[PDB]
Design a protein around this ligand. Structure first.
Ligand SMILES: CC(C)CCC[C@@H](C)[C@H]1CC[C@H]2[C@@H]3CC=C4C[C@@H](O)CC[C@]4(C)[C@H]3CC[C@]12C
Ligand SMILES: CC(C)CCC[C@@H](C)[C@H]1CC[C@H]2[C@@H]3CC=C4C[C@@H](O)CC[C@]4(C)[C@H]3CC[C@]12C
Ligand SMILES: CC(C)CCC[C@@H](C)[C@H]1CC[C@H]2[C@@H]3CC=C4C[C@@H](O)CC[C@]4(C)[C@H]3CC[C@]12C
Ligand SMILES: CCCCCCCC/C=C/CCCCCCCC(=O)OC[C@H](O)CO
Ligand SMILES: CCCCCCCC/C=C\CCCCCCCC(=O)OC[C@H](O)CO
Ligand SMILES: CCCCCCCC/C=C\CCCCCCCC(=O)OC[C@H](O)CO
Ligand SMILES: CCCCCCCC/C=C\CCCCCCCC(=O)OC[C@H](O)CO
Ligand SMILES: CCCCCCCC/C=C\CCCCCCCC(=O)O
Ligand SMILES: CCCCCCCC/C=C\CCCCCCCC(=O)O
Ligand SMILES: CCCCCCCC/C=C\CCCCCCCC(=O)O
Ligand SMILES: CCCCCCCC/C=C\CCCCCCCC(=O)O
Ligand SMILES: CCCCCCCC/C=C\CCCCCCCC(=O)O
Ligand SMILES: CCCCCCCC/C=C\CCCCCCCC(=O)O
Ligand SMILES: CCCCCCCC/C=C\CCCCCCCC(=O)O
Ligand SMILES: CCCCCCCC/C=C\CCCCCCCC(=O)O
Ligand SMILES: CCCCCCCC/C=C\CCCCCCCC(=O)O
Ligand SMILES: CCCCCCCC/C=C\CCCCCCCC(=O)O
Ligand SMILES: CCCCCCCC/C=C\CCCCCCCC(=O)O
Ligand SMILES: CCCCCCCC/C=C\CCCCCCCC(=O)O
Ligand SMILES: CCCCCCCC/C=C\CCCCCCCC(=O)O
Ligand SMILES: CCCCCCCC/C=C\CCCCCCCC(=O)O
Ligand SMILES: CCCCCCCC/C=C\CCCCCCCC(=O)O
Ligand SMILES: CCCCCCCC/C=C\CCCCCCCC(=O)O
Ligand SMILES: CCCCCCCC/C=C\CCCCCCCC(=O)O
Ligand SMILES: CCCCCCCC/C=C\CCCCCCCC(=O)O
Ligand SMILES: CCCCCCCC/C=C\CCCCCCCC(=O)O
Ligand SMILES: CCCCCCCC/C=C\CCCCCCCC(=O)O
Length: 390
């Protein structure tokens, strides 16, 4: 006395097709933008393109595969495994791309001087090619023998009248739930997500620490100037200048103007240090006053350009952290439900409508990333305008 299955099926099928169209259109626009604008052609966005290629494949293949496996049609169990598991291949690829982006950004903020030599486009494409081969091996592991094809549901296969060697193609009838929980969720999804959480925490820690160091060196320059103007003994000017020369060199360690600025700064510190060692207090106090002009016309510009760059890395890393968060928000419900089905055999199985609500929610993840770029990355947003208005 249940309502006809095709009614609820029509809603689910229609919602899936709507998601597939939006996932294809949005992520093709991402790939078109990277191809068009040279400012978007860096190593980081090569993983973003690999991320967009997987979401395009979700709408082109994974979502039609989801509609197919919802019917329970008769099929050879191994071809039925590919239909069920190919979305795991695409999802795993996205995990590798997201982990590489966070690692790339950690390298850009921990060792920015060595980034361009270490992280190159040739090495990135190799990483992406390797991670795609690993994603196939991980997602299609049930095809290697870790499946329930050896224990078919003979009642379901005879009721639907399947042929010899065929089974009723159902995700939970062919894909073992211990693979989905232990291997896929715990090892291949949950652990990499916790790793990205650790990488981003180190990124924000590295940014907060470097921002504090610039202010410490900047305040050390100005506070030690007051020590010189109010000094009385030659050693009071010598010790104050010694702690400035270190703060001057430790700050530097149109790019020649920033180097020429520290040369005048440290060159003036050595001048006053020579006068302070000779005992000339007044002549060293006046020599140290010339540092104020150099601080304004040179050092103050570096303080706020290096601060502006670090703040851009914080803002950009937060935008990329949202993509990881929305990935977790879209996929965790489906994983959590699998944990209930596997770990609590005495719990009632999650209802049909909730299963397909979680399945649909995981597919919406292929729609959100182009919106994050448009709202949080100006270079993506301006290129999106240029593409659309033209
Ligand atoms: C380049 C792209 C677009 C090619 C698309 C490949 C897809 C559509 C092909 C490749 C393998 C095929 C599967 C392999 C054989 C199985 C078993 C059969 O009993 C039912 C069909 C089924 C489930 C096929 C469904 C369609 C299938 C998944
Ligand atoms: C990551 C964020 C969105 C958290 C998501 C919470 C979801 C995944 C949780 C909250 C309540 C949970 C449900 C509460 C208990 C019921 C009854 C049980 O017989 C089957 C599991 C089922 C249906 C759970 C399924 C998963 C569930 C719906
Ligand atoms: C990303 C972070 C939040 C980790 C994910 C949380 C998961 C691993 C936790 C949260 C809720 C937990 C479930 C809540 C209680 C149920 C019922 C119990 O009889 C079996 C364990 C089971 C099924 C737990 C399995 C693991 C579980 C799903
Ligand atoms: C089976 C599921 C789990 C298995 C996981 C552990 C496998 C062990 C190690 C595999 C080596 C990696 C193989 C992938 C590399 C393929 C070759 C390639 O494309 O690399 C080109 C790169 O640019 C350089 O040449
Ligand atoms: C239909 C094919 C059959 C199945 C396709 C699967 C996923 C598609 C894989 C495509 C991987 C794209 C990676 C990429 O584009 O990275 C290059 C980067 O832009 C460097 O410039
Ligand atoms: C690119 C488009 C992809 C489409 C997915 C193809 C889905 C696979 C189609 C299975 C249909 C089938 O073989 O059904 C046999 C049925 O049992 C006989 O009545
Ligand atoms: C890179 C992956 C890192 C860790 C693997 C995650 C561990 C996967 C799950 C832990 C082992 C476990 O729970 O298995 C118990 C066994 O199944 C009793 O039946
Ligand atoms: C909501 C949609 C319900 C669709 C019911 C499936 C039967 C379609 C045939 C018909 O429209 O007459
Ligand atoms: C946000 C995405 C909105 C999803 C909207 C609802 C989809 C729920 C599908 C439930 C319909 C019945 C499922 C089925 O019969 O197979
Ligand atoms: C949007 C396109 C229309 C989708 C309707 C699904 C009908 C298929 C069915 O359930 O029989
Ligand atoms: C199906 C969609 C396949 C085409 C996706 C590639 C387009 C991206 C681009 O225009 O560069
Ligand atoms: C079927 C799935 C196809 C997925 C998309 C392939 C797009 C390849 C990337 C094209 C743009 C290259 C670039 O950004 O420089
Ligand atoms: C790119 C190619 C675009 C065209 C896609 C090709 C057709 C896609 C799927 C068709 C599914 C046919 C359903 C089989 C019905 C089984 C039956 O007739 O009994
Ligand atoms: C451009 C590539 C995408 C175009 C094709 C996708 C549109 C059709 C999607 C899949 C239709 C569902 C096929 C399920 C067949 C069930 C077999 C059965 O009748 O029991
Ligand atoms: C272009 C896509 C147009 C609509 C595709 C809808 C395919 C219908 C799937 C029904 C599955 C079934 O055979 O029961
Ligand atoms: C790239 C080419 C993509 C197409 C690859 C092969 C799809 C057809 C193979 C499906 C085998 C059907 C199994 C069967 O007859 O029961
Ligand atoms: C690129 C080459 C694509 C070749 C075929 C892709 C699908 C292979 C078939 C999956 C296993 C199902 C089967 O072979 O019976
Ligand atoms: C510049 C980078 C281009 C990336 C290209 C991505 C294409 C990767 C192709 C598929 C590799 C699949 C091979 C994996 C074999 C094991 C899977 C299995 O059969 O179980
Ligand atoms: C491009 C790579 C595409 C898919 C590789 C083929 C996956 C099939 C795994 C082995 C299963 C089988 O041959 O029966
Ligand atoms: C993420 C890391 C998760 C680590 C493993 C926790 C798994 C605990 C399950 C114990 C076995 C339960 C059982 O008897 O089936
Ligand atoms: C198969 C060899 C694996 C090692 C090479 C891949 C490089 C590291 C990949 C991810 C491992 C987990 C990353 C955790 C934080 C790493 C960032 C760091 O410590 O610098
Ligand atoms: C793996 C990481 C688990 C999450 C905890 C974050 C680690 C931060 C690293 C650090 O603070 O030094
Ligand atoms: C387990 C959950 C997280 C452990 C705490 C992570 C460490 C916080 C940052 C450490 C620090 O402030 O230096
Ligand atoms: C699981 C946690 C989900 C966290 C991701 C939510 C993103 C919030 C950022 C925002 O849009 O303001
Ligand atoms: C599992 C944790 C995944 C979420 C971590 C990303 C940060 C969330 C956010 O900043 O919105
Ligand atoms: C939209 C929110 C949808 C539901 C969230 C909680 C789902 C819990 C389902 C309870 C039904 C049951 O367990 O029998
Ligand atoms: C509903 C599916 C996505 C859940 C949250 C959407 C956030 C929208 C956005 O950040 O652009």
């Amino acid at each position: 006395d249940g309502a006809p299955p095709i009614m609820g099926s029509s809603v689910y099928i229609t919602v899936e097709l709507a998601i597939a169209v939006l996932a294809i259109l949005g992520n093709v626009l991402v790939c078109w933008a990277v191809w068009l604008n040279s400012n978007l052609q860096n190593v980081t966005n090569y993983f973003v393109v690999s991320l967009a290629a997987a979401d395009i494949a979700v709408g082109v293949l994974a979502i039609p595969f989801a509609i197919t496996i919802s019917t329970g049609f008769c099929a050879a169990c191994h071809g039925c495994l590919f239909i069920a598991c190919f979305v795991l291949v695409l999802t795993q690829s996205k995990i590798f791309s997201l982990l590489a982006i966070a690692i790339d950004r950690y390298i850009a903020i921990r060792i920015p001087l060595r980034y361009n030599g270490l992280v190159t486009g040739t090495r990135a494409k190799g990483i992406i090619a390797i991670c795609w081969v690993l994603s196939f091996a991980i997602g299609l592991t049930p095809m290697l023998g870790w499946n329930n094809c050896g224990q078919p549901k003979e009642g379901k296969n005879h009721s639907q009248g399947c042929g010899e060697g065929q089974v009723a193609c159902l995700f939970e009838d062919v894909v073992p739930m211990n693979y989905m929980v232990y291997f896929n969720f715990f090892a291949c999804v949950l652990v990499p997500l916790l790793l990205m959480l650790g990488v981003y925490l180190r990124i924000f820690l590295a940014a907060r620490r470097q921002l504090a160091d610039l202010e410490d060196n900047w305040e050390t320059l100005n506070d030690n100037l007051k020590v010189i103007e109010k000094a009385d003994n030659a050693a009071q000017v010598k010790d104050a200048l010694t702690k400035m020369r270190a703060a001057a060199l430790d700050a530097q360690k149109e790019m020649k103007d920033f180097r020429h600025g520290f040369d005048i700064l440290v060159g003036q510190i050595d001048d006053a240090l020579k006068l302070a060692n000779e005992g000339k207090v007044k002549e060293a106090q006046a020599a140290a006053e010339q540092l104020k002009t150099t601080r304004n016309a040179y050092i103050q510009k570096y303080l706020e350009r290096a601060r502006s760059t670090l703040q851009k890395e914080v803002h950009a890393a937060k935008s990329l952290a949202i993509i990881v968060g929305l990935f977790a928000l879209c996929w965790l419900p489906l994983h959590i439900i699998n944990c209930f089905t596997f770990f609590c055999p005495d719990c009632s199985h999650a209802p049909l409508w909730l299963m397909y609500l979680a399945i649909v929610l995981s597919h919406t993840n292929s729609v959100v990333n182009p919106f994050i770029y448009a709202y949080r990355i100006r270079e993506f947003r301006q290129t999106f305008r240029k593409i659309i208005r033209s």
